[PDB]
Motif scaffolding. Structure first.
Motif, PDB file in Angstrom:
ATOM      1  N   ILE A 135      24.570  53.063  45.438  1.00 58.87           N
ATOM      2  CA  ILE A 135      25.820  53.587  45.957  1.00 58.87           C
ATOM      3  C   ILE A 135      26.924  52.546  45.857  1.00 58.87           C
ATOM      4  CG2 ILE A 135      27.074  54.228  48.031  1.00 58.87           C
ATOM      5  CD1 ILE A 135      24.107  55.669  46.320  1.00 58.87           C
ATOM      6  N   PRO A 136      26.638  51.297  46.248  1.00 63.37           N
ATOM      7  CA  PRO A 136      27.631  50.225  46.201  1.00 63.37           C
ATOM      8  C   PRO A 136      28.263  50.112  44.825  1.00 63.37           C
ATOM      9  CG  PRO A 136      25.640  49.460  47.296  1.00 63.37           C
ATOM     10  CD  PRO A 136      25.341  50.838  46.767  1.00 63.37           C
ATOM     11  N   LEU A 137      27.437  50.088  43.785  1.00 68.46           N
ATOM     12  CA  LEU A 137      27.966  50.039  42.434  1.00 68.46           C
ATOM     13  C   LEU A 137      28.608  51.383  42.150  1.00 68.46           C
ATOM     14  CD1 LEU A 137      24.649  50.350  42.362  1.00 68.46           C
ATOM     15  CD2 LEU A 137      24.884  48.285  40.976  1.00 68.46           C
ATOM     16  N   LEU A 138      27.859  52.445  42.450  1.00 61.63           N
ATOM     17  CA  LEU A 138      28.368  53.794  42.274  1.00 61.63           C
ATOM     18  C   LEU A 138      29.683  53.928  43.031  1.00 61.63           C
ATOM     19  CD1 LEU A 138      26.419  56.945  41.865  1.00 61.63           C
ATOM     20  CD2 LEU A 138      28.181  57.017  43.638  1.00 61.63           C
ATOM     21  N   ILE A 139      29.746  53.267  44.187  1.00 63.76           N
ATOM     22  CA  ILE A 139      30.944  53.266  45.014  1.00 63.76           C
ATOM     23  C   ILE A 139      31.951  52.284  44.443  1.00 63.76           C
ATOM     24  CG2 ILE A 139      31.919  52.875  47.296  1.00 63.76           C
ATOM     25  CD1 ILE A 139      30.047  55.249  47.068  1.00 63.76           C
ATOM     26  N   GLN A 140      31.492  51.053  44.238  1.00 64.29           N
ATOM     27  CA  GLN A 140      32.336  50.014  43.678  1.00 64.29           C
ATOM     28  C   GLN A 140      32.976  50.516  42.395  1.00 64.29           C
ATOM     29  OE1 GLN A 140      32.972  47.088  46.029  1.00 64.29           O
ATOM     30  NE2 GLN A 140      32.455  49.262  46.256  1.00 64.29           N
ATOM     31  N   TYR A 141      32.247  51.367  41.675  1.00 64.66           N
ATOM     32  CA  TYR A 141      32.759  51.932  40.441  1.00 64.66           C
ATOM     33  C   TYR A 141      33.883  52.916  40.744  1.00 64.66           C
ATOM     34  CZ  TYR A 141      32.295  56.820  39.100  1.00 64.66           C
ATOM     35  OH  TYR A 141      32.503  58.168  38.916  1.00 64.66           O
ATOM     36  N   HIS A 142      33.686  53.742  41.774  1.00 62.49           N
ATOM     37  CA  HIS A 142      34.706  54.708  42.164  1.00 62.49           C
ATOM     38  C   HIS A 142      35.873  53.998  42.833  1.00 62.49           C
ATOM     39  CE1 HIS A 142      32.190  58.196  41.323  1.00 62.49           C
ATOM     40  NE2 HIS A 142      31.229  57.696  42.081  1.00 62.49           N
ATOM     41  N   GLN A 143      35.549  53.099  43.756  1.00 63.74           N
ATOM     42  CA  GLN A 143      36.559  52.351  44.488  1.00 63.74           C
ATOM     43  C   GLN A 143      37.594  51.768  43.531  1.00 63.74           C
ATOM     44  OE1 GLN A 143      36.520  51.554  47.956  1.00 63.74           O
ATOM     45  NE2 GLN A 143      34.417  51.968  48.623  1.00 63.74           N
ATOM     46  N   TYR A 144      37.153  51.453  42.318  1.00 65.74           N
ATOM     47  CA  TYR A 144      38.034  50.887  41.305  1.00 65.74           C
ATOM     48  C   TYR A 144      38.361  51.916  40.227  1.00 65.74           C
ATOM     49  CZ  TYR A 144      37.610  46.138  43.120  1.00 65.74           C
ATOM     50  OH  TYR A 144      37.682  45.011  43.905  1.00 65.74           O
ATOM     51  N   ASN A 145      37.636  51.849  39.115  1.00 62.60           N
ATOM     52  CA  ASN A 145      37.848  52.774  38.007  1.00 62.60           C
ATOM     53  C   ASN A 145      38.026  54.201  38.513  1.00 62.60           C
ATOM     54  OD1 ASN A 145      36.913  50.405  36.428  1.00 62.60           O
ATOM     55  ND2 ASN A 145      34.883  51.082  37.108  1.00 62.60           N
ATOM     56  N   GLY A 146      38.138  55.143  37.582  1.00 62.67           N
ATOM     57  CA  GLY A 146      38.311  56.536  37.952  1.00 62.67           C
ATOM     58  C   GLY A 146      37.178  57.053  38.816  1.00 62.67           C
ATOM     59  N   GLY A 147      36.382  57.963  38.262  1.00 60.36           N
ATOM     60  CA  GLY A 147      35.267  58.522  39.003  1.00 60.36           C
ATOM     61  C   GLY A 147      35.680  59.692  39.875  1.00 60.36           C
ATOM     62  N   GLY A 148      36.190  60.746  39.245  1.00 56.67           N
ATOM     63  CA  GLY A 148      36.616  61.919  39.989  1.00 56.67           C
ATOM     64  C   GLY A 148      36.748  61.638  41.472  1.00 56.67           C
ATOM     65  N   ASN A 185      18.542  46.630  48.322  1.00 60.32           N
ATOM     66  CA  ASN A 185      19.732  47.400  47.982  1.00 60.32           C
ATOM     67  C   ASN A 185      20.135  48.317  49.135  1.00 60.32           C
ATOM     68  OD1 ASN A 185      17.877  49.978  46.998  1.00 60.32           O
ATOM     69  ND2 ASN A 185      17.121  47.994  46.269  1.00 60.32           N
ATOM     70  N   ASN A 186      19.401  48.227  50.239  1.00 56.04           N
ATOM     71  CA  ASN A 186      19.681  49.047  51.411  1.00 56.04           C
ATOM     72  C   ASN A 186      21.144  48.922  51.826  1.00 56.04           C
ATOM     73  OD1 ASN A 186      17.180  46.873  52.826  1.00 56.04           O
ATOM     74  ND2 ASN A 186      19.190  46.332  51.986  1.00 56.04           N
ATOM     75  N   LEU A 187      21.980  49.813  51.303  1.00 51.57           N
ATOM     76  CA  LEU A 187      23.405  49.803  51.618  1.00 51.57           C
ATOM     77  C   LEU A 187      23.688  48.972  52.863  1.00 51.57           C
ATOM     78  CD1 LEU A 187      24.717  53.272  50.638  1.00 51.57           C
ATOM     79  CD2 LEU A 187      23.577  51.454  49.358  1.00 51.57           C
ATOM     80  N   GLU A 188      23.994  49.657  53.958  1.00 54.52           N
ATOM     81  CA  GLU A 188      24.290  48.997  55.222  1.00 54.52           C
ATOM     82  C   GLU A 188      25.021  47.683  54.994  1.00 54.52           C
ATOM     83  OE1 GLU A 188      20.371  50.063  56.208  1.00 54.52           O
ATOM     84  OE2 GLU A 188      19.591  48.038  55.864  1.00 54.52           O
ATOM     85  N   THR A 189      26.346  47.756  55.006  1.00 54.38           N
ATOM     86  CA  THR A 189      27.185  46.583  54.804  1.00 54.38           C
ATOM     87  C   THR A 189      28.524  46.977  54.191  1.00 54.38           C
ATOM     88  OG1 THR A 189      27.291  44.430  53.695  1.00 54.38           O
ATOM     89  CG2 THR A 189      26.117  46.132  52.544  1.00 54.38           C
ATOM     90  N   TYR A 190      28.600  48.202  53.682  1.00 51.97           N
ATOM     91  CA  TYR A 190      29.824  48.695  53.063  1.00 51.97           C
ATOM     92  C   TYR A 190      30.679  49.455  54.055  1.00 51.97           C
ATOM     93  CZ  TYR A 190      26.828  47.672  49.158  1.00 51.97           C
ATOM     94  OH  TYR A 190      25.972  47.042  48.284  1.00 51.97           O
ATOM     95  N   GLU A 191      31.941  49.077  54.146  1.00 52.21           N
ATOM     96  CA  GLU A 191      32.854  49.757  55.044  1.00 52.21           C
ATOM     97  C   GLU A 191      32.612  51.250  54.960  1.00 52.21           C
ATOM     98  OE1 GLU A 191      36.799  48.916  53.640  1.00 52.21           O
ATOM     99  OE2 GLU A 191      36.037  47.505  52.137  1.00 52.21           O
ATOM    100  N   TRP A 192      32.165  51.689  53.787  1.00 46.94           N
ATOM    101  CA  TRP A 192      31.924  53.096  53.538  1.00 46.94           C
ATOM    102  C   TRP A 192      30.560  53.579  54.026  1.00 46.94           C
ATOM    103  CZ3 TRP A 192      27.757  52.794  50.346  1.00 46.94           C
ATOM    104  CH2 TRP A 192      27.637  51.678  49.511  1.00 46.94           C
ATOM    105  N   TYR A 193      29.568  52.698  54.069  1.00 50.50           N
ATOM    106  CA  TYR A 193      28.236  53.117  54.494  1.00 50.50           C
ATOM    107  C   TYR A 193      28.153  53.394  55.985  1.00 50.50           C
ATOM    108  CZ  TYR A 193      23.217  53.763  54.176  1.00 50.50           C
ATOM    109  OH  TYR A 193      21.952  54.301  54.195  1.00 50.50           O
ATOM    110  N   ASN A 194      27.496  54.499  56.310  1.00 54.50           N
ATOM    111  CA  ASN A 194      27.291  54.907  57.693  1.00 54.50           C
ATOM    112  C   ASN A 194      25.879  55.454  57.868  1.00 54.50           C
ATOM    113  OD1 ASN A 194      29.146  54.343  59.674  1.00 54.50           O
ATOM    114  ND2 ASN A 194      30.523  56.024  59.123  1.00 54.50           N
ATOM    115  N   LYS A 195      24.978  54.599  58.340  1.00 51.56           N
ATOM    116  CA  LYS A 195      23.585  54.981  58.532  1.00 51.56           C
ATOM    117  C   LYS A 195      23.433  56.078  59.585  1.00 51.56           C
ATOM    118  CE  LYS A 195      24.994  51.824  59.662  1.00 51.56           C
ATOM    119  NZ  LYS A 195      26.402  51.997  59.211  1.00 51.56           N
TER     120      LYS A 195
END
Length: 108
Positions: A84-97, A1-11
C-alpha cells in the motif's frame, strides 16, 4: 511491510471511521487506509473536502493484490504494487486515478 505508520493507514478501521477522520481532515482527496483480510489487500480511505451535499465525496479504495511481479496490490486493476505504501506513495505522487491519487493520507 505491515503498514501502520502512514498518515493514511488506519488499523482496525471501518468505512464510517475513515469518513469521520476524512471529514475531519478535509484535504480534498484525504487519503486513508484500512486492512481487510482477503489475499492481503489493504483499504484506502480517500476524502474530498465535504461538509454537505455540495459535491465533496469520500471514497474507500481497496488495494487489490496480484502475486507481486509485476507488483501485487492496486486500486483499479491499475498500476499494482508490492505494498500500500508504494501503491500509496505512487498515488500520493504520480497520477493513479483515485479521487486525487492520494491527495493527503489521513491518519485518525
Amino acid at each position: 511491510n505491515n503498514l501502520e505508520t502512514y498518515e493514511w493507514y488506519n488499523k482496525s478501521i471501518s468505512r464510517d471511521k475513515a469518513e469521520k477522520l476524512l471529514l475531519d481532515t478535509g484535504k480534498e482527496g484525504a487519503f486513508m487506509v484500512r486492512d481487510s483480510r482477503t489475499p492481503g489487500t489493504y483499504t484506502v480511505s480517500v476524502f474530498t473536502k465535504a461538509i454537505i451535499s455540495e459535491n465533496p465525496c469520500i471514497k474507500h479504495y481497496h488495494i487489490k493484490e496480484t502475486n507481486d511481479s509485476p507488483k501485487r496490490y492496486y486500486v483499479a486493476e491499475k498500476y499494482v504494487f508490492d505494498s500500500i505504501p508504494l501503491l500509496i506513495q505512487y498515488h500520493q505522487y504520480n497520477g493513479g486515478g483515485l479521487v486525487t491519487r492520494l491527495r493527503y493520507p489521513v491518519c485518525g
